[PDB]
Amino acid sequence: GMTIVEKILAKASGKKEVSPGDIVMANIDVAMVHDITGPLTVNTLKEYGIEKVWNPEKIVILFDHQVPADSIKAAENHILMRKFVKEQGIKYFYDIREGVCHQVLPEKGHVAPGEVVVGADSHTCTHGAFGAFATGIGSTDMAHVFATGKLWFKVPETIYFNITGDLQPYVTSKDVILSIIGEVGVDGATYKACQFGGETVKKMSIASRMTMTNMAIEMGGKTGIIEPDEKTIQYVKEAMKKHGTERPFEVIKGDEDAEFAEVYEIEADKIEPVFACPHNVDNVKQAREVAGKPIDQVFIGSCTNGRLEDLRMAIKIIEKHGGIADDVRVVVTPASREEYLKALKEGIIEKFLKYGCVVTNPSCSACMGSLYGVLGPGEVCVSTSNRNFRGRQGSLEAEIYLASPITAAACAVKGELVDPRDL
Ligand SMILES: CC(C)(O)CC(C)(C)O
Ligand SMILES: [Mg+2]
């Protein structure tokens, strides 16, 4: 009787069974690296004299196509990456501006149910939306992965969030996950896989599911995971066909009599629009109880969201209420080029433009970085981001409220923190 994570790690280590706390050596299906972890990893490999990665088709590299105009080190790192990709015969390499980190990997078909996914970023948990075991690892582990196609993992315990009921109007999976995190706390799920399931999750789209697993790490989770269903299978198969990345996969599900460290019953019909308020993702408040505070900027589409359903719900709110308030900069960033195209074809982009919204291209590098330069001092911002920028948020006592795309759009409309149901 095993959880989905246990089964995935059992299969991957060739074991009959696995229990939390077991330390097992698991085959890696896909390893993703972007920005600096790329050059660290390649360098470590050079130092050990490793001529070849284990499988050039199970490595996904995101890297800036533009040579950085000043620093010679980054031009050097850039030449290094191109050499590696070429010599190793790495098939799957993408511009850092193909999309935000965690959008590009699944949309090209690189994440299937039952797979072990490792990534250089803290928010690789995102890919657990696909019934995959997905974790962020450092460059030392990443070099080991590139060399051998294996890594030691400690099997985590699972907390199961059973989410049932129907989401009320104007409420999204962003509000569900934020509400879960306000209760559990930034450290409440340390070492644990956070599994979301239940009738409410079944009805959610893949896009909505990804927003939840995206933020598992924000409560100290080891990862986030949702079992695959028909929507999952069809998304993955369609993505594989579009990009030529077909490979066999096994849909793995947890057992009905699996053990969990904890089980939360989440009443979805009770979730309301919420904000994560400065300065902790933990500090979650019902929108009404903060409503009224004037705001300077709104970011709709961020790390990792701004998929088509996010852009729809945002543009519907804005266009219905006649555009955006005065003295609010509203930046709209589709999660990927592929998502940008879908929005373009549906006339959504043209409409954001019409209301004086800035529409900008996504960049994986933006998710990793400093917010120095984007927010002015003392400015209040509403963001659909699913990750914190603590430490380097940044410029410097700027205030940043995390919200769903619906609430973010509402805020853009009124020019203040507002509950979208109150427009
Ligand atoms: C990446 C970003 C520009 O969306 C972050 C934020 C916090 C300003 O939304
Ligand atoms: Mg992210």
Using CA positions, which residue lies closest to atom 7 of ligand 1? 383
Using CA positions, which residue lies closest to atom 9 of ligand 1? 383
Phi, psi of 34 (to 5 degrees): -140, 160
Using CA positions, which residue lies closest to atom 4 of ligand 1? 302
Q: How remote is the CA of residue 209 from the centroid of ligand 1, in Å?
A: 20
Phi, psi of 65 (to 5 degrees): -70, -30
Q: Is 400 in the pocket of ligand 1 (CB under 6 A)?
A: yes
Cited resolution, angstroms: 1.8
Answer yes or no: are the C-beta atoms of 26 and 153 closer than 8 Å. Answer: yes
364 annotated as a binding-site residue? yes
Q: Is 401 in the pocket of ligand 1 (CB under 6 A)?
A: no
- Distance between alpha carbon 133 and the CA centroid of its chain, in Å? 14
Closest CA to 30 of 50, 11, 55: 55
303 annotated as a binding-site residue? yes
DSSP string, 150-181: EEEEEPPPEEEEEEES-PPTT--HHHHHHHHH
Looking from the CA of residue 389, the nearest atom of ligand 1 is 7
Q: Is 299 in the pocket of ligand 1 (CB under 6 A)?
A: yes
For 364-415, what is the HEC assignment? HHHHHCCCECCECCCCEEEECCCCCCCCCCCCCCCEEEECCHHHHHHHHHHC
- Give the C-alpha separation, 276 to 266, whole Å: 18
Give the DSSP H or E segment for 87: helix 72-88
Q: Are strands 358-359 and 329-332 parallel, antiparallel or unpaired?
A: parallel
Q: How remote is the CA of residue 387 from the centroid of ligand 1, in Å?
A: 9
Closest CA to 375 of 401, 395, 360: 395
- Give the C-alpha separation, 304 to 310, whole Å: 11
First-last CA distance in the chain: 49
DSSP string, 233-277: HHHHHHHHHHHT-----------TT---SEEEEEEGGG---EEE-
Show the domains of the chain with their CATH numbers. 3-273 (3.30.499.10), 276-423 (3.30.499.10)
Residues 6+ positions from 118 with CB-CB distance below 8 Å: 28, 30, 31, 32, 124, 134, 135, 136, 137, 141, 142, 145, 151
Q: Is 382 in the pocket of ligand 1 (CB under 6 A)?
A: no
Q: Is 112 in the pocket of ligand 1 (CB under 6 A)?
A: no
Closest CA to 108 of 94, 123, 122, 128: 94
Helix and strand totals (H; E) in the chain: 14, 18
Please report, for residues 279, 333, 339, the alpha-carbon distance to residue 291 in angstroms, rounded to integers and kept in the order given.
17, 25, 31
Report CA torsion sign: 32, 35, 39, 41.
negative
Looking at residue 194, the DSSP 8-state letter turns out to be E
194 annotated as a binding-site residue? no
Give the DSSP H or E segment for 210: helix 206-214
Q: Is 330 in the pocket of ligand 1 (CB under 6 A)?
A: no
* Cβ density class 143-171: b for 16+ within 10 Å, e for less: bbbbbebbbebebbbbbbbbbeeebeebb
Residue in the structure block whose two tokens are 């059973």: 162
- Give the C-alpha separation, 330 to 382, whole Å: 9
Residues 6+ positions from 414 with CB-CB distance below 8 Å: 325, 423
Phi, psi of 369 (to 5 degrees): -95, -165
Experimental technique behind these coordinates? X-ray
**Which burial class, exposed, middle or buried, applies to 256 when counting CB atoms under 10 A from its CB (0-12, 13-18, 19+)?**
exposed
